[PDB]
Structure 1
Amino acid sequence: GKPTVLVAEKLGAAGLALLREFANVDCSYGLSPEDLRAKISLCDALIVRSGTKVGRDVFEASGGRLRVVGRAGVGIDNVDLAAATEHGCLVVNAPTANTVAAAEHGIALLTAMARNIAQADASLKAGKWQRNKYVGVSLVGKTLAILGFGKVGSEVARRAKGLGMHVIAHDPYASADRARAIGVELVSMEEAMTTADFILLHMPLTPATDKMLNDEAFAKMKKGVRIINVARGGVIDEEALVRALDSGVVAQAALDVFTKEPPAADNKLVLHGNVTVTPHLGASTVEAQEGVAIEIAEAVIGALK
């Protein structure tokens, strides 16, 4: 029994060594839609991370051998998810490993924002010693607002209440009991906008969330509010955040994800003074890398059986 698993995108040797113990593993890496279509007819399972677009044509082209698609990581946006099961192909993901290291990165964005770790380190490496330019805020007692109470959203909260913040969340799909059991009040969407000193974005990018943080949302906010985006860019109106920081509605902004990766080489948020930008690093911790590998590994393998 030699099941065949095509691994389209780089994968953590920890997991590749689990798959190789339970399957044939093809690691052709980055194939053109046609190469892939040619291979998938001969694969009992496909594993992808983010770049591979498991479209409708990919299921169509397999001819019913492809049983299970393994999405390494958290999101699944790229698997045509309705074709998948229409053709009778299970789709499984690797959420919990990247989830930890992704809230970990949000918190790291929040604290480093709040004290200007980033600008200051640049200022001092550049010889300048400008102690008065980089005075930060505290976190204790500050109200943090979480939009979209996912695993990361609630894992974040848990870390932010450990830093001693008041943490609130808005997400119409959120178990009032789970929230109250970590100490998070579920609040209205206007209450979250107004009363927050800090706002993080953990929302999926749907038509209802697109360009959500636009000029109307920034008006409702408290002045002196700071904002951290670790979910998906473009859920912010990028031009509108450029204008709210230029005014002093938003005091400073911490941005992992963008509307475009790589962002424009002139793109104003990335270049702005009060912004702390990292290049979609949210799940870039060695530990998650190796634990996501092992997760879809065990996930694919358990489907396949």
Structure 2
Amino acid sequence: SLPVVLIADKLAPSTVAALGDQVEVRWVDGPDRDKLLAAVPEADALLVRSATTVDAEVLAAAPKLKIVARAGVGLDNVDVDAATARGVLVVNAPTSNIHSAAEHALALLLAASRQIPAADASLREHTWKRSSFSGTEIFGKTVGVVGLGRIGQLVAQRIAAFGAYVVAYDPYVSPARAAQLGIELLSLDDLLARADFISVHLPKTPETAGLIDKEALAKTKPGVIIVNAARGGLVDEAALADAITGGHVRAAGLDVFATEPCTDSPLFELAQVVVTPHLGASTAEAQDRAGTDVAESVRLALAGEFVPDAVNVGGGVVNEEVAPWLDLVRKLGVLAGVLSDELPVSLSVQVRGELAAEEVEVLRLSALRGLFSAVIEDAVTFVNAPALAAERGVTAEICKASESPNHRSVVDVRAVGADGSVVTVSGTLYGPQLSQKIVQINGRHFDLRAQGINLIIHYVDRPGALGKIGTLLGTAGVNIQAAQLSEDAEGPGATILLRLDQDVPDDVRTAIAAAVDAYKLEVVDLS
């Protein structure tokens, strides 16, 4: 009895030939709800593009669904939580648009530097205004790449062949990886100061949103050309218009908008700003690749094989014993990354005690997901480790030990720095509810909920420090839910971790740092 693969959006049979001859492939008009709901009961797999919405209704109606595959990068049209909730593997095609997007960033940079649209318009109005235009030459210039994921990397490679010097800002690429690319890693401030061109290649996360605001725009070089074909809003639209109009930034190119569909932007009134309706992946080659990618993911998944491009966890993929640990270990990765001075070159995950008897490779992926959350979009839960290692230069391993010193099971995440220094964070689960607990940081033991807004301070001025901190926080109106503090075993230092009911305003953070003479002050949300 051949497995049924239901295609609910416009993917050609040829596009999806990677599926074997071992499946029955059917098509449905996905956007038509009645049709979809009638066709899906029999489906073992469902492929979709962007037009079909794979909500809970669809899922409830598909009792033998094993995979939802989105032929694209976004997951807006799929409820991944509901799919995980029902043991359905969700997959996308995460690298299918990279060349088309890189090429479009370059397209936009050149189109802005040489005013292609306006010039084309003048000739289109049957006049010859050659004398009016003045372009900007790329050769010899410095180009700032803000975000060095896959696409930012391709843009740097292409722009470098124009004879431009490439610098980048990305706290999430190792220095050795950047050096292998022949790219100079910079603070954002230094990139701003130095760059004649800026191309943004960040994901949208609240760490990222409106990164380049007016404050940032004012630090750039006069004459900068700035391109964003990444995510709407990374560059503050109104601040750009201001800077464009004022003359300070010569030109810009945008493919994405704070909200789209966008038809009313003031930027649309500015000639020196080239704009395209989110076309970065609007390419036959990218749409075909999205399809052949996802056709292979669906093959592997039906072959009981391992699915690299998986986005979540669904099925036998993970035991009931292990499953609750995924989220805890993700939080340990977040924590180890925050407590680290810079990006670790690797994570060692040690699994000890009873849990060590389980199959726990997924825990290695959780740690990495946590470490990299600032550059990962929420829907995704799994990330491709080999790709992460090759793209960003960071690896993870798992080690097991039969014995856990205190709790019946503990997981330790060791974040190791290029200089051989190590940051260690541990958690357990226990109890009828399996509450997640952080139980160690760097040789100090305690028992704190792995949840909420946590403030962590390493500091040097000790006496009355508890009072100073709690008094500043409480004057700011901030509740302190739980706390852990200890004076360092060796040295003048001390450390404290507090769970708060809200974030800490910057001025008050500055006040606290000043009050106890902090060398490290961080606020991390563990929810």
What TM-score, normalized to structure 1? 0.89
CA 1:160/1:33 → structure 2, altered by over 3 Å: closer, same or farther? same
Per the TM alignment, residue 221 of structure 1 is displaced from its structure 2 partner at its CA by: 1.8
2:4 aligned partner? 4
Between Structure 1 and Structure 2, which shows a larger proportion of helix residues? Answer: 1
CA 1:39/1:209 → structure 2, altered by over 3 Å: closer, same or farther? farther
CA 1:216/1:141 → structure 2, altered by over 3 Å: closer, same or farther? same
CA 1:215/1:89 → structure 2, altered by over 3 Å: closer, same or farther? same
* 1:285 aligns to 2:283 (yes or no): yes
Give me the whole-angstrom Cα distance separating, in 2, the residues matched to 1:13 and 1:220. Answer: 52
CA 1:270/1:66 → structure 2, altered by over 3 Å: closer, same or farther? farther
Per the TM alignment, residue 156 of structure 1 is displaced from its structure 2 partner at its CA by: 0.9
2:199 aligned partner? 200
Q: How does 1:165-184 map to 2 (within 5 A)?
A: 165-184=164-183
Give the greater-gyration-radius structure (CA). 2
Q: Contact between 1:4 and 1:26, CA under 8 Å: does it hold in 2?
A: yes
Per the TM alignment, residue 13 of structure 1 is displaced from its structure 2 partner at its CA by: 4.6
Per the TM alignment, residue 33 of structure 1 is displaced from its structure 2 partner at its CA by: 6.0
Which range moves more in the overlay, 19-28 or 110-119? 19-28
CA 1:298/1:282 → structure 2, altered by over 3 Å: closer, same or farther? same
Q: Deviations over 1:111-136 (max 9, x none)?
A: 12111122111112222211222110
Give me the CA root mean square deviation. Answer: 2.4
Q: Contact between 1:15 and 1:295, CA under 8 Å: does it hold in 2?
A: no
Q: Deviations over 1:143-190 (max 9, x none)?
A: 211222121110111101111111122222213333211211222122
Q: Contact between 1:3 and 1:44, CA under 8 Å: does it hold in 2?
A: yes
Q: How does 1:15-30 map to 2 (within 5 A)?
A: 15-19=15-19, 21-30=21-30
1:9 counterpart letter in structure 2: D
Give me the whole-angstrom Cα distance separating, in 2, the residues matched to 1:263 and 1:185. Answer: 36
Per the TM alignment, residue 49 of structure 1 is displaced from its structure 2 partner at its CA by: 2.5
2:46 aligned partner? 46
Between Structure 1 and Structure 2, which shows a larger proportion of strand residues? Answer: 2
Give me the whole-angstrom Cα distance separating, in 1, the residues matched to 2:134 and 2:71. Answer: 41
Size of the aligned set, in residue pairs, is 303
2:212 aligned partner? 213
Per the TM alignment, residue 282 of structure 1 is displaced from its structure 2 partner at its CA by: 1.0
Give me the whole-angstrom Cα distance separating, in 1, the residues matched to 2:32 and 2:208. Answer: 32
Q: Contact between 2:71 and 2:287, CA under 8 Å: does it hold in 1?
A: no
Which range moves more in the overlay, 79-88 or 92-101? 79-88
Q: How does 1:237-276 map to 2 (within 5 A)?
A: 237-264=236-263, 266-276=264-274
2:143 aligned partner? 144
CA 1:53/1:193 → structure 2, altered by over 3 Å: closer, same or farther? farther
1:272 counterpart letter in structure 2: L
1:31 counterpart letter in structure 2: P
Unaligned runs of 5+ in 1: none
2:96 aligned partner? 97
Q: Contact between 1:12 and 1:294, CA under 8 Å: does it hold in 2?
A: no
Q: Deviations over 1:272-295 (max 9, x none)?
A: 211111222112222223222211
CA 1:72/1:269 → structure 2, altered by over 3 Å: closer, same or farther? same
Q: Contact between 2:31 and 2:53, CA under 8 Å: does it hold in 1?
A: no
Q: Deviations over 1:219-273 (max 9, x none)?
A: 2222211111111112232222221211112211111122333312x32213321
Per the TM alignment, residue 56 of structure 1 is displaced from its structure 2 partner at its CA by: 4.8
Unaligned runs of 5+ in 2: 304-527
Give me the whole-angstrom Cα distance separating, in 1, the residues matched to 2:48 and 2:173. Answer: 29
SS in structure 1 opposite 2:95?
helix
SS in structure 2 opposite 1:303?
helix
1:158 counterpart letter in structure 2: Q
Per the TM alignment, residue 35 of structure 1 is displaced from its structure 2 partner at its CA by: 5.6
Per the TM alignment, residue 214 of structure 1 is displaced from its structure 2 partner at its CA by: 2.2
Give me the whole-angstrom Cα distance separating, in 1, the residues matched to 2:194 and 2:140. Answer: 12
SS in structure 2 opposite 1:273?
coil
1:26 counterpart letter in structure 2: R
Greater relative contact order (CA < 8 Å, ≥ 6 in sequence):
1
Give me the whole-angstrom Cα distance separating, in 2, the residues matched to 1:179 and 1:34. Answer: 51
Which ranges of 4 or more aligned residues in structure 1 deviate by more than 6 Å?
none
1:186 aligned partner? 185
Give me the whole-angstrom Cα distance separating, in 2, the residues matched to 1:12 and 1:174. Answer: 38
2:155 counterpart letter in structure 1: V
Give me the whole-angstrom Cα distance separating, in 1, the residues matched to 2:14 and 2:258. Answer: 32
